């Protein structure tokens, strides 16, 4: 009666990709033959399999496909008695995610570069500062070769790329090549505030801490000059320049405002302080910079990035507001308000607060404005931003809706999360909703699929979702019901999950001061069967550079940035719900999601 095929919006080479094939209003067993071909040409058969479909499994089939590597499109075709579906889907060559660890962030001419490539046939390339290739080749993931830097070379930021054979997208890592000596001390800086007021009257301070690499305080003096960084260019304040003593490794540098006004009588830029510390003996010095102090009107910024831009008239709308500091770091415990809806909440640690908004039934368009309301801030120093959400278009003006509801906050693996199916529409159609179909999406692949019975009268249906580490760093929950074998009603929601390691890795030690040559004994606690890679670096190397290094947070960042879903959920209509969540859909009544323009989110 109605047949549906769901696949991820983009398909990856060489990895198990689960797909969904469903039969609505058909109580008859059948075998289904399913093929994938290159498109438009249909030259070679890329994958094939036959699967059993029965009332035993609720007429639902979840097979997996693998496309061996051989803009580029494919066609998933499925056929059997009564069934003929075909979806054209975009292909990506990024089979998995690659990350490059390097030995250190800075090298001298004529030294080696030790590196590892990790994966969540591969080749690795080395590029010069001028952007000229100098290495390329297949890499044995059990064995890497150090790369030898020539005695005469170009100085500056090189880059290393790791990729699959015929892919246009990559992971890139950096390292500097400089004629440098390691300094005997680190300098750490502490700003007075995380921001500077464009039109304020406060001074700006920087606390300098200078300590030798083995622990004692440094004695000496510091030279600090303040400036402004306009996109790329740095524009100094020549009368900032002050010399201050560093006594017992401590010192405080101060930029006066009337000195700042005198030179700047600014929007969208940052205050920087450049700091040069010298030992009392004159033996060596260190140069670091305090950056990212945005010149602003408000200490905060409001964002609507985590709210759906669509609503369901007559159902309560879930507004998820997000506040950060100017650098974009979450700002916790910040009260937010929307006057027009007399709504009010305060920000959790993740920087979010959930506000439920009651909306009229005849609204097609919904405009929202949110203000910070911080106890310690004058009105004109609060932050605000505006948005307007637009109503989900029902299929053929039917008035039938679906809403998925989550009240749980700061989601971590281990939890059991209530997920609500909230349904609304005409009494005639509602009495036909016999089940719900749901899809869990993680890392751009369809992770799990299940069914949720609805009995008659049940317009609120709650089920449980148990969260494992498989859902890190975030997952999408998408659901739909179908009415009388041709209307589809759908919703989706985006759920953040706490970004830890999927497993566990600790390096345990005694923590006592040691002696050159002393016997050391360290402990490694990890998962059974883990390959662990180690390195020891003189702390003096972090002093000089630390922005290129690998970290768990960077792993999860890049993986998120390559999510095929582009939206915080819901959509224009049935079609858009799937499109925005990174899905493809084709039915037997040609309900087809449009073609995906680019793999990287609009």
């Amino acid at each position: 009666a109605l047949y549906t095929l769901i696949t991820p919006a983009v398909l990856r080479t060489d990895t198990e990709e689960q797909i969904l094939v469903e039969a609505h209003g058909d109580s008859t067993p059948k075998q289904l033959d399913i093929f994938v071909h290159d498109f438009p040409r249909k030259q070679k058969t890329l994958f094939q399999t036959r699967v059993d479909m029965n009332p035993a499994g609720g007429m639902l089939v979840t097979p997996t496909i693998e496309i061996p590597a051989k803009n580029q499109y494919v066609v998933v075709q499925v056929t059997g008695p009564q069934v003929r579906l075909e979806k054209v889907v975009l292909l990506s060559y990024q089979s998995s995610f690659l990350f490059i660890q390097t030995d250190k962030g800075i090298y001298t001419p004529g030294s080696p570069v030790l590196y590892r490539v990790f994966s969540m046939t591969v080749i690795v390339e080395f590029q010069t500062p001028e952007g000229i290739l100098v290495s390329s080749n297949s890499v044995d993931l059990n064995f890497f070769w150090p790369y030898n830097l020539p005695d005469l070379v170009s100085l500056g930021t090189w880059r290393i790329v790791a990729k699959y054979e015929h892919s246009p997208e990559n992971y890139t890592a950096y390292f500097d090549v400089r004629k440098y000596v390691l300094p005997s001390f680190e300098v750490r800086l502490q700003p007075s505030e995380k921001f500077f007021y464009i039109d304020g009257n406060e001074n700006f301070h920087v606390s300098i801490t200078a300590r030798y690499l083995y622990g004692e305080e440094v004695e000496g003096v510091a030279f600090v000059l303040f400036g402004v960084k306009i996109d790329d260019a740095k524009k100094s304040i020549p009368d900032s320049l002050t010399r201050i003593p560093i006594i017992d490794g401590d010192g405080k540098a101060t930029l006066k405002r009337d000195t700042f006004r005198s030179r700047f009588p600014l929007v969208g830029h940052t205050l920087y302080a450049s700091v040069t510390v010298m030992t009392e003996s004159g033996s060596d010095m260190v140069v670091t910079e305090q950056s990212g102090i945005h010149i602003v009107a408000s200490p905060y910024q409001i964002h609507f990035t985590k709210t759906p831009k669509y609503f369901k008239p007559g159902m309560p709308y879930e507004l998820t507001v997000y506040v950060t500091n100017p650098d974009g770091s979450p700002a916790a415990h910040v009260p937010v308000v929307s006057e027009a809806f007399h709504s009010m909440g305060t920000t959790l640690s993740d920087g979010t607060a959930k506000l439920i908004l009651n909306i009229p039934l005849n609204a097609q368009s919904l405009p929202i404005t949110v203000r910070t309301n911080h106890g310690d801030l004058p009105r004109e120093r609060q932050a605000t931003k505006s948005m307007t959400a637009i109503a989900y278009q029902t299929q053929g003006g039917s008035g039938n809706y679906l809403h998925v509801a989550i009240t749980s906050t700061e989601i971590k693996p281990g939890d059991n999360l209530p997920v609500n199916f909230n349904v609304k529409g005409n009494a005639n159609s509602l009495k036909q909703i016999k089940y719900f179909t749901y899809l869990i999406l993680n890392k751009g692949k369809i992770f799990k699929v299940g069914r949720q019975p609805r009995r008659d009268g049940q317009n609120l249906v709650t089920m449980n979702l148990h969260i494992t580490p498989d859902l890190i760093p975030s997952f999408r929950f998408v659901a739909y019901y179908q009415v009388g074998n041709n209307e589809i009603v759908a919703d989706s929601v985006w759920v953040d999950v706490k970004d830890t390691c999927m497993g566990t890795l600790v390096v345990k030690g005694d923590n006592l001061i040691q002696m050159p040559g002393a016997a050391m004994k360290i402990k490694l606690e990890g998962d059974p069967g883990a390959r662990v890679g180690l390195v020891a670096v003189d702390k003096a190397v972090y002093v000089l550079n630390d922005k290129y290094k690998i970290s768990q947070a960077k792993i999860w960042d890049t993986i998120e940035k390559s999510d095929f879903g582009c939206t915080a959920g819901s959509g224009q209509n049935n079609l858009g719900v799937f499109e925005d969540a990174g899905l493809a859909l084709t039915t037997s009544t040609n309900l087809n999601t449009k073609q995906r323009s680019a793999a990287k989110c609009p």
Partner: protein
């Protein structure tokens, strides 16, 4: 592109090929031969043949203790900001605390905290910070430098002047109570240099040779060769004085076990003409160290240092006079017993 390349190097005995459908480095300055069947760039670095920022004048005059006097001037168009005068003490010397403390409280100045023992600032490296150095007239400061401990050989100290907007460009001067310039004394010919000691080594006399005590001298660690030589001619190359000499006899032989087949060069500064009273065609007793050797031509050359022993050896004409005769024997015994037995 459907290429197939091949490069020929006089360097490599077999040429290199690569299918362009890339780098190779040498250590030579030769013609390349390329064959195609794309763009190429070739790079060839070689070594091709003081104080732009400040004027620095550092003297140390005598207090009739020493007065350290420093004068500086920025050579820029505008007064330099936030300039630094980096000072090291002569060995066993220490700043008069009272003076240094007066300088420390100066309007536009700063110096770090220092401890004090009996009017002696407890710092060997002293750094004075100034807000500005003038670009138009010289700026000077002075203070007394106090002799704490007596010492053989004072190491000269140094003064560096540099400013905030020019840290990499450092102007350095040295100062010594004896050597005006404070530079360690050395000798160079063409481009190669060796240490000289500073103390100008005088010729030896030497009335009755204590032959046992002399063997002892010519047998210590640092004595590698012992020759009898002949002063053929005196010249002046890059290094002011060249004494050309010929090895007449070999009494003890250096690691280079082979002399006498090559004319030797002995080199000393014009400031040393007086004390080394070498005359042409006179015979000389010479021994020294092979750490004094200075490479050149096919010829073997050393430089005259305090490790070099120089004594005139009379001629046979001379070896009949009442004054010279008992010494000629002394020289004959010495040669004989050293050459026949070793140490």
């Amino acid at each position: 592109l459907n290429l197939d390349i091949t490069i020929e190097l006089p360097d490599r005995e077999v040429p290199i090929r690569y299918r362009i459908n890339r780098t190779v480095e040498t250590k030579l300055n030769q013609d390349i031969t390329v064959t195609a069947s794309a763009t190429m760039t070739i790079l060839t670095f070689y070594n091709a043949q003081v104080c732009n920022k400040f004027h620095l004048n550092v003297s140390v005059e005598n207090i009739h203790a020493l007065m350290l006097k420093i004068c500086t001037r920025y050579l820029g168009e505008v007064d330099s900001t936030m300039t630094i005068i980096d000072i090291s003490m002569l060995t066993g010397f220490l700043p008069d605390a009272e003076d240094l403390t007066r300088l420390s409280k100066g309007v536009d100045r700063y110096i770090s905290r220092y401890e004090v023992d009996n009017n002696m600032a407890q710092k060997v490296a002293v750094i004075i910070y100034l807000n500005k150095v003038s670009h138009s007239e010289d700026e000077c400061l002075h203070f007394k430098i106090l002799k704490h401990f007596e010492v053989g050989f004072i190491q000269p100290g140094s003064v560096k002047v540099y400013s905030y907007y020019n840290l990499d460009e450092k102007c350095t001067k040295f100062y010594h109570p004896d050597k005006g310039t404070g530079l360690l004394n050395k000798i160079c010919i063409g481009n190669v240099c060796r240490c000289a000691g500073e103390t100008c080594s005088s010729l030896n006399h030497q009335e009755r040779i204590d032959v046992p005590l002399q063997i002892e001298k010519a047998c210590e660690t640092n004595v590698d060769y012992v020759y009898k030589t002949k002063l053929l001619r005196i010249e002046e190359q890059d290094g002011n004085d060249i004494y050309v000499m010929d090895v007449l006899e070999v009494i003890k032989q250096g690691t280079d076990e082979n002399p006498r087949a090559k004319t030797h060069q002995y080199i000393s500064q014009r400031k040393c003409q007086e004390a080394l009273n070498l005359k042409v065609n006179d015979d000389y007793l010479i021994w020294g160290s092979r750490s004094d050797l200075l490479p050149t031509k096919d010829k073997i050359s050393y430089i005259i240092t305090k490790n070099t022993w120089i004594e005139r050896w009379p001629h046979e004409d001379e070896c009949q006079e009442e004054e010279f005769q008992k010494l000629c024997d002394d020289f004959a015994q010495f040669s004989y017993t050293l050459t026949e037995f070793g140490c």
